[PDB]
Design an enzyme around this catalytic site. Sequence first.
Site, short mmCIF file in Angstrom:
data_model
loop_
_atom_site.label_atom_id
_atom_site.label_comp_id
_atom_site.label_asym_id
_atom_site.label_seq_id
_atom_site.Cartn_x
_atom_site.Cartn_y
_atom_site.Cartn_z
N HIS A 38 0.80 -1.23 0.00
CA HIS A 38 0.00 0.00 0.00
C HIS A 38 0.85 1.30 0.00
O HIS A 38 0.27 2.38 -0.08
CB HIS A 38 -1.07 0.02 1.10
CG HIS A 38 -0.58 0.21 2.51
ND1 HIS A 38 -0.60 -0.84 3.42
CD2 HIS A 38 -0.16 1.32 3.15
CE1 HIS A 38 -0.18 -0.34 4.57
NE2 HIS A 38 0.10 0.96 4.46
N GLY A 79 2.50 5.97 10.49
CA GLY A 79 3.90 5.88 10.09
C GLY A 79 4.59 4.59 10.54
O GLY A 79 5.74 4.34 10.16
N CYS A 81 3.64 1.50 9.70
CA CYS A 81 3.49 0.42 8.70
C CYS A 81 4.85 -0.08 8.22
O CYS A 81 5.76 0.72 8.04
CB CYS A 81 2.61 0.86 7.54
SG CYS A 81 0.90 1.23 8.01
O1 LIG Z 1 -4.34 1.86 9.20
C1 LIG Z 1 -3.48 2.59 8.69
N1 LIG Z 1 -2.41 3.07 9.38
C2 LIG Z 1 -2.09 2.88 10.74
C3 LIG Z 1 -1.43 1.75 11.24
N2 LIG Z 1 -1.19 1.51 12.53
C4 LIG Z 1 -1.59 2.42 13.41
C5 LIG Z 1 -2.26 3.62 13.06
C6 LIG Z 1 -2.67 4.58 14.02
C7 LIG Z 1 -3.27 5.74 13.62
C8 LIG Z 1 -3.52 5.99 12.27
C9 LIG Z 1 -3.16 5.07 11.32
C10 LIG Z 1 -2.51 3.86 11.68
C11 LIG Z 1 -3.59 3.10 7.25
C12 LIG Z 1 -4.67 4.18 7.17
O2 LIG Z 1 -5.87 3.51 6.69
C13 LIG Z 1 -5.51 2.30 6.13
C14 LIG Z 1 -6.33 1.41 5.45
C15 LIG Z 1 -5.78 0.23 4.97
C16 LIG Z 1 -4.42 -0.01 5.15
CL1 LIG Z 1 -3.73 -1.48 4.53
C17 LIG Z 1 -3.61 0.88 5.82
C18 LIG Z 1 -4.17 2.04 6.34
#
Ligand SMILES: O=C(Nc1cncc2ccccc12)[C@@H]1COc2ccc(Cl)cc21
Lengths: 305, 306
Positions: free
Chosen positions: B41, B143, B145
Amino acid sequence: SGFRKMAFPSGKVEGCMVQVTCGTTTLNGLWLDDVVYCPRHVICTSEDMLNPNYEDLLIRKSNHNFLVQAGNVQLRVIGHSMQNCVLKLKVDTANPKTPKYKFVRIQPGQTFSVLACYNGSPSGVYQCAMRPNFTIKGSFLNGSCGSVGFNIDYDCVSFCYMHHMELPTGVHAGTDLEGNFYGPFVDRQTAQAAGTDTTITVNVLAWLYAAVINGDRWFLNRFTTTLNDFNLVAMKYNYEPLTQDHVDILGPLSAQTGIAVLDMCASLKELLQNGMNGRTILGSALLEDEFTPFDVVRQCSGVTF
Amino acid sequence: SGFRKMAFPSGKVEGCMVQVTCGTTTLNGLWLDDVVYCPRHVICTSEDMLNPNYEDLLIRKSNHNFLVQAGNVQLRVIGHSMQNCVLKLKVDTANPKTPKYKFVRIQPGQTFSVLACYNGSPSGVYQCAMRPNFTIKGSFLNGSCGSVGFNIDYDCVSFCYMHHMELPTGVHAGTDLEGNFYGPFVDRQTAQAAGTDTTITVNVLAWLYAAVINGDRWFLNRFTTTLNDFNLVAMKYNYEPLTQDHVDILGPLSAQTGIAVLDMCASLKELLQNGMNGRTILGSALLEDEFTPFDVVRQCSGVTFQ
Ligand SMILES: O=C(Nc1cncc2ccccc12)[C@@H]1COc2ccc(Cl)cc21
Ligand SMILES: O=C(Nc1cncc2ccccc12)[C@@H]1COc2ccc(Cl)cc21
Ligand SMILES: [Cl-]
Ligand SMILES: [Cl-]
């Protein structure tokens, strides 16, 4: 989201762990520049430990009696001296993996990461606090002596603890890296015990702010309290007194959540007098006191090292 | 003595963390030999996330659209391919800090250490478990990921998890290092929800054996149970069923303490019925389920405190 007991990344410290052997005793050492630091009780037999005269035991040793192993390489000891309860072994090779570092003495309530080691090899990393009774609730087996505690400030590793012994209740005692013990303990096999412990109040408050940031608000109430009335309650429950310094340190967390420190104190008072009533806070049925205000801000902001 | 939630030393993994950038998106990558692994992604915009067509998005990219940064050094991307939900970037330099490693897919109940990273820089290390609903209760901000989960039994790093997303309840979902998600999740911003979670029974039993090894026996009782009667009661408290495989796995701990598995199951049934009555077990007022039988044996002494 989420809130975990989190330790600093241990890589900078792993590259400093070595194995120290003197006769039949094997423990861990910390190799920084051309010096290996380790507990001075490495020179003792079990009978020596009953009543040791360390200067006397040490004068009988030569450089070659200390075997220092760094990974698969044998280091050469070219000098030895004692500073308080730490033995310093001068070696011919400076550690090429020596990080930027400082030796710091911490206060009760301050937290740090422990890199547990056996035979100079790191086995695990965990986070813990210096209790108000100067012990730590660690997880250590025989062979763990010389394992170290540390914090990372910016890119500088601040070494704050070296492991020396286990007390009869299963809790642990050690020194700063200058060999001064935390607490009224001595490096001798004699009757010693941990004193009555108390809860670190400023840390419980920090953890309640972390729960609010993570969406846990059932414990909040409309009430406030004075610092003097809160301290009379805290004394009744074996909690450490909360000072104006603690109130000031919780300022940023108070401004972020919109809950004044004395407003959160009124929540803590109600939790002490009534319990949780079947509820939990951040997955816990007990009030957690091993996260400082700085730990909470760091984890809720993603600071890297 | 003592029993702590303990993570593996993170040094071997810290030397693999890199920053991956594609246009406006920045996340973390894992640099092993001459390949950087990261969530696919990273090629998406926020609008792409509802129904992305990753094959169509990737064919439009060239090697020089991916910026990879290792410390203060810029790595050169010489190839790219997708495997399931992971993007693999071939680089012109092999990582000199590459440890001995393996890619392993874990089962629910298994534990691992997570090295949380931001911008290719490690920030912290904590211990996690794959929940029965295939989510993990992590601590991750925007951030994070590309942050990875791992075990280091002996000298080899077994990578088992790569972080991809946060679900609406605040729990986390990700893939193995071959890009296959754990659970029925997709790397899409469509409506998704974690299933009802349950307690990992075999892990609670392991933790009760750790408490006995460390000297605590207050919760033991004179009773035993059948495996079927235990499971009927466990499922009423939202506990996972205990299988004969779990009973076999608890064998060494049973032999060390002298307490049969079905005897320990009867203690668990009584704890679920009565609660702790103001007492704690290994410093906890709740029953802990994020220590496996293997974790207990690795951390505890081989001699029980009788
Ligand atoms: O979840 C996501 N990022 C985050 C990961 N871990 C923690 C977070 C905490 C706060 C904000 C974002 C966080 C992104 C945003 O929306 C999506 C949808 C699908 C995917 Cl594969 C990835 C994302
Ligand atoms: O405590 C000691 N070692 C240990 C440290 N940590 C954990 C242990 C767990 C089990 C067994 C020993 C452990 C030694 C043994 O008795 C003494 C007396 C004084 C000193 Cl300074 C050091 C020691
Ligand atoms: Cl309470
Ligand atoms: Cl597994």
